[PDB]
Design a protein around this nucleic acid. Structure first.
Ligand code: MG
Ligand code: MG
Ligand code: MG
Ligand code: MG
Ligand code: MG
Ligand code: MG
Ligand code: MG
Ligand code: MG
Ligand code: MG
Ligand code: MG
Ligand code: MG
Ligand code: MG
Ligand code: MG
Ligand code: MG
Ligand code: MG
Ligand code: MG
Ligand code: MG
Ligand code: MG
Ligand code: MG
Ligand code: MG
Ligand code: MG
Ligand code: MG
Ligand code: MG
Ligand code: MG
Ligand code: MG
Ligand code: MG
Ligand code: MG
Ligand code: MG
Ligand code: MG
Ligand code: MG
Ligand code: MG
Ligand code: MG
Ligand code: MG
Ligand code: MG
Ligand code: MG
Ligand code: MG
Ligand code: MG
Ligand code: MG
Ligand code: MG
Ligand code: MG
Ligand code: MG
Ligand code: MG
Ligand code: MG
Ligand code: MG
Ligand code: MG
Ligand code: MG
Ligand code: MG
Ligand code: MG
Ligand code: MG
Ligand code: MG
Ligand code: MG
Ligand code: MG
Lengths: 141, 148, 183, 123, 52
RNA sequence: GUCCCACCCAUACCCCGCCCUCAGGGUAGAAACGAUGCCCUGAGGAGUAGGCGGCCGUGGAGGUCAGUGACGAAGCCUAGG
RNA sequence: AGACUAAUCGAACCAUCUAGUAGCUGGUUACCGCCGAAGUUUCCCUCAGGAUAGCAGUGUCGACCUUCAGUUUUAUGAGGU
RNA sequence: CCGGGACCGAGGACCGCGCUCUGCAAGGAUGCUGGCGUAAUGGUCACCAGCGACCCGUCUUGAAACACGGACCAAGGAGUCAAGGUUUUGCGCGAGUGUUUGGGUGUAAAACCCGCACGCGUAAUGAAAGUGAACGUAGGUGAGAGCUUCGGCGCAUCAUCGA
RNA sequence: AGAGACCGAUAGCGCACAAGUAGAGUGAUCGAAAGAUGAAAAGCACUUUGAAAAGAGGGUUAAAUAGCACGUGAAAUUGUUGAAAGGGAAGCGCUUGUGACCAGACUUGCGCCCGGCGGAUCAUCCGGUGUUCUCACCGGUGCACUCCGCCGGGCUCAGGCCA
């Protein structure tokens, strides 16, 4: 055939609508891109098998590409929400990524993304008051 | 496009790549083909031997149509037959019929004899024919006939 | 100081294709892997020829293939990293298996009609990853109109740059003894 | 805290000021390579301004790194700052100058949630 | 005014480009990478009954 | 004038770090990669005229960022980063 | 008196041909990286200029072939300082 | 074989050469401890100090020149475009190739479609009349990448003798 | 009459304005500069000082440092204020010092034990869906020698600057 993951990467390597390039780095805002980096490894929209993790209301929501529905986008994503426990979510995501050979190279990235989202969903601590060093004398008067 | 040109790279460099001693003046050496038998003679003799002088006789009011006689070789003679019929002849499904080729209809006037011919009879109608082409057609078993 | 005649000398050969063809890039990746992971010099030669410009990949005709198919080469697979064209002068196309960068429509049709086989270079890599039983062919590099003009000079019999051909165009004084001298 | 990294070395802190820009107001201080035939700076006379060279290039490990060890990433909204979710130890968000105050507050709140350092958070 | 405003393109190359664009239009990743919202599209070469 | 000892320092020499250039290798039954990437090793760096490469900036056009903005765009000033 | 002919006269003023031609003078606009000269040959109403070869850059290609060398050695010629 | 001093610590799981072999000074710094946790370190600016430092551009063998231009500032300001040619890139098709003079059509200067002729190429040579390209598996010799059944087959290209 | 990958008030026609105008020349001819308050003049009533121009109050406005010298308002150049240096130039490079003024970093985070508080899944099993067909999700069960979170104490590890 004329179309493959390598061909799609060849045609989308230099520019695509998900690319965000600037000094100090080039990122990708693709939904199926763990680490949000621009590379064949993580450009999930070009690969037949890919994973994406987004925040849920209380846990994480994981989408995986279904290989048989690559031409049917409305039914091309297998979605599952994990809102029980951080460790159970990690276990399920790691199984999803490695047990059946579905992008085993993305296991660490997917677990780290789930951990980062769950950490962000925690309450934030208030910032300590900011001290003054040169403004202290001028504002003390 | 202007952004790919070397003038953009010469910005900030005085003399724009034309040198400081030689300065890109207007026309040193003259315009066009000035000095062909002089300062430019070295070039006009190294390249273009035969630039100067006359050779041969004149033809007032030359009408190019008088000399129209495009030529085709016998090696491409069989390419004038349609591909299916040509394949039938080459494989041998006829051997009782001969193809008659109208070179003038195909746009040719003279038949030349560069290539080889398969041993298949073929009638060729041509205004002109070379001796070798005629001999080769006859040996292949056909004939050439003059048609004007 | 180190007193060197040459410093920072760059390699004079191509290291990648100047083309932006995506399929050519994929083919180059495939043959880079093959040339790295195999001992066959065939793979390295094919990889280097995949970088080459079009004038460095002159076309090969069916008649040129037929010439080299003789003398014990009939069952070898013909490999041409170039375009394979047809030849009207060849009336009978021999049965042949050819892997080429591309084929013209007539060349492909005649090869298939003669009982032969047409392959791409990735198919060739699949069936013969080491290039075994292959016949690697190149087209005529110098058979080009521009080359006829190269190196023009006295007593070199090259083609001059003229706007037209005729008695009035570069044929007098420098080309015959009746007009001073000949070349 | 940023990722462990080798100490940051600059090799130079001065700006490579243009020749005679200190004497002529028509000359901006931005560096220009002197092309003059007699130019002492071009000929590298002792005691003159230095010309920039590739030898001054910073270490590849610490290039584009602010003293805290982070690389600046310019963000214009919350969705932009969310791109740094997996990079809170290597990248710090810098809010664009033309961002409104409410959007700045939203970006700062989201960056606090994500643990991403903001270089220009105070306002 | 006699600047070369228009560009002559081979018809064969025009037809290749058109065919290549048509082929690319059938690849779902390419639509998203070009910025189309096709997450709810039932099938990438989306065909609607001509009776509609 | 001759002979001897110690010492001073060049952008030279030696050792080390870093930048770039050039060169030579590794990297897929892919747990895979801005393969235009990464990893390993060696050497080299003056330059007018001039050549080539890569990049920065400006006016306008197509696509895209579901981009920024009267809760303040652009511009301008700034011994603040 | 080459004087005067509207402050203009060894050929007035105005507009146009006209952006007249100049081998001559002046100028010719961001950065970094790599390479890097010549003022010599032959011809030219040639001598403040050209073409021509040389020196230079870039792009390649060829098996980069086991050859190449501003060097020494050995053997063997020439020269008239 | 013993001291005394200086500068430096690149790399980052293991892998290797090894030794004085439960370990080691053997393919690159660790261990212990103290003060401070802020303008203390550090950066920027102004000034003093030590050493260094001629005015740029240009022509030129040679410029800081008693060589020329430059009082200062803002804005403007100089290798463009067309035709023709050439070589080298990238493309499409390929013994062919080129739709767009024109016609058809159109959501109307776009896009799409069509073909007769024509240009270039497919044959050269001679002033011209004119003639016009295979003895050979399209030749022999020496090389020649790559294949090889290991006996040779020999691309491109070069030199050479032939047709 | 319709358009533009055109120009945008030193540009674009010489002319975006009472521009072929003002002005110059006997004349033929030559020939400029010059756009922008504000949404709306609401274009500053009134008091006071002054001969007046104006100033100071006051008023209009979202805004008067938008006041017909009117959007923004650069540089050259100038005034005041503050700091500093200066024995026939100054500027500048390397390097400290002083003074002034500052950006960061830090003020924690990980784990492991011992108590307190809260919750209901924590394993397992059953059923239904999904899926990469063995990995999950959703319901039912669980029901406190589980699981999760928040406080309090102790310990461990890492983490800033100068030594
Ligand atoms: Mg230069
Ligand atoms: Mg000049
Ligand atoms: Mg000269
Ligand atoms: Mg010249
Ligand atoms: Mg050196
Ligand atoms: Mg001779
Ligand atoms: Mg005679
Ligand atoms: Mg004569
Ligand atoms: Mg700096
Ligand atoms: Mg000089
Ligand atoms: Mg070095
Ligand atoms: Mg250099
Ligand atoms: Mg413009
Ligand atoms: Mg603003
Ligand atoms: Mg007289
Ligand atoms: Mg008069
Ligand atoms: Mg008079
Ligand atoms: Mg007169
Ligand atoms: Mg006049
Ligand atoms: Mg050099
Ligand atoms: Mg003469
Ligand atoms: Mg001169
Ligand atoms: Mg003598
Ligand atoms: Mg003598
Ligand atoms: Mg300090
Ligand atoms: Mg000083
Ligand atoms: Mg001095
Ligand atoms: Mg002189
Ligand atoms: Mg000078
Ligand atoms: Mg003097
Ligand atoms: Mg002079
Ligand atoms: Mg002069
Ligand atoms: Mg002057
Ligand atoms: Mg302007
Ligand atoms: Mg300007
Ligand atoms: Mg041209
Ligand atoms: Mg034709
Ligand atoms: Mg003829
Ligand atoms: Mg061999
Ligand atoms: Mg105007
Ligand atoms: Mg004006
Ligand atoms: Mg005007
Ligand atoms: Mg008048
Ligand atoms: Mg105004
Ligand atoms: Mg007011
Ligand atoms: Mg104001
Ligand atoms: Mg205002
Ligand atoms: Mg104003
Ligand atoms: Mg000022
Ligand atoms: Mg001085
Ligand atoms: Mg200091
Ligand atoms: Mg359950």
């Amino acid at each position: 055939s004329n179309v493959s993951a390598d061909l799609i990467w060849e045609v989308s390597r230099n520019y695509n609508s998900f690319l965000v390039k600037q000094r100090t780095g080039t990122f990708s805002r693709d939904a199926l891109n763990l680490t949000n980096q621009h590379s064949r490894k993580h450009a999930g929209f070009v690969n037949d098998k890919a994973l994406g993790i987004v925040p849920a209301e209380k846990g994480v929501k994981v989408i995986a590409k279904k290989v048989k529905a690559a031409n049917k986008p409305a039914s091309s994503l297998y979605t599952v929400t994990y809102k029980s426990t951080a460790r159970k979510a990690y276990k399920a995501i790691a199984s999803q990524a490695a047990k059946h050979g579905y992008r085993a190279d993305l296991r660490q990235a997917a677990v780290a993304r789930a951990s980062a989202i769950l950490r962000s969903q925690r309450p934030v601590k208030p910032e300590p008051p900011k001290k003054l060093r040169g403004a202290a004398a001028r504002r003390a008067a | 496009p202007t952004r790919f040109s070397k003038t953009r790279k010469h910005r900030g460099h005085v003399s724009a790549g034309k040198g400081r001693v030689g300065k890109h003046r207007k026309h040193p050496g003259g315009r066009g083909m000035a000095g062909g038998q002089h300062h430019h003679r070295t070039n006009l003799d190294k390249y273009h031997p035969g630039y100067f002088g006359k050779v041969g006789m004149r033809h007032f009011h030359l009408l190019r149509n008088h000399y129209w006689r495009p030529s085709i070789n016998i090696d491409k003679l069989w390419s004038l037959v349609p591909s299916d019929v040509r394949e039938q002849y080459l494989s041998g499904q006829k051997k009782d019929t001969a193809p008659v080729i109208d070179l003038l209809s195909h746009g040719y006037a003279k038949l030349l004899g560069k290539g080889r011919l398969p041993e298949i009879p073929v009638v060729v109608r041509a205004r002109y024919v070379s001796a070798e082409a005629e001999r080769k057609v006859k040996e292949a078993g056909g004939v050439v006939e003059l048609v004007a | 100081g180190i007193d060197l005649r040459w410093k920072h000398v760059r390699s004079s050969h191509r290291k990648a294709p100047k083309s932006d063809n995506v399929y050519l890039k994929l083919l180059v990746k495939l043959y880079r892997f093959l040339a790295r992971r195999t001992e066959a010099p065939f793979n390295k030669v094919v990889l280097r020829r995949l970088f080459m410009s079009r004038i460095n990949r002159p076309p090969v005709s069916l008649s040129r293939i037929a010439r080299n198919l003789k003398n014990g080469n009939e069952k070898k697979t013909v490999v041409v990293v170039a375009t394979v064209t047809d030849d009207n002068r060849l009336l009978q196309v021999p049965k042949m298996e050819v892997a080429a960068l591309r084929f013209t429509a007539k060349a492909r049709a005649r090869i298939e009609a003669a009982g032969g086989r047409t392959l791409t270079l990735d198919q060739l890599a699949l069936e013969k990853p080491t290039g075994a039983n292959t016949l690697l062919l190149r087209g005529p590099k110098n058979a080009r109109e521009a080359v006829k003009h190269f190196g023009f000079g006295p007593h070199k019999h090259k083609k001059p740059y003229v706007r037209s051909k005729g008695r009035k165009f570069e044929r007098a004084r420098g080309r015959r003894r009746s007009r001073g001298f000949k070349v | 805290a940023a990722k462990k990294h080798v100490p940051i070395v600059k090799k130079r802190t001065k700006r490579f000021m243009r020749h005679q820009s200190d004497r002529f107001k028509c000359l901006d201080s931005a560096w220009r390579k002197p092309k003059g035939i007699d130019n002492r700076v071009r000929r590298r006379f002792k005691g003159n301004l230095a010309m920039p060279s590739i030898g001054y290039g910073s270490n590849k490990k610490t290039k584009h790194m602010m003293p805290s060890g982070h690389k600046a990433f310019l963000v214009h909204n919350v969705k932009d700052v969310e791109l740094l979710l997996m990079h809170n130890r290597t990248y710090a968000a810098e809010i664009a100058h033309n961002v409104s105050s409410r959007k700045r507050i939203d970006i700062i709140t989201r960056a606090k949630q994500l643990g991403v350092k903001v270089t220009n958070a105070k306002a | 005014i006699w600047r070369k405003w228009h560009v002559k393109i081979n018809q064969g190359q025009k037809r290749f480009a058109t065919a290549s664009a048509l082929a690319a239009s059938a690849v779902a990743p390419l639509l998203m990478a070009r910025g189309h919202q096709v997450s709810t599209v039932p099938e990438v070469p989306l065909v609607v009954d001509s009776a509609a």
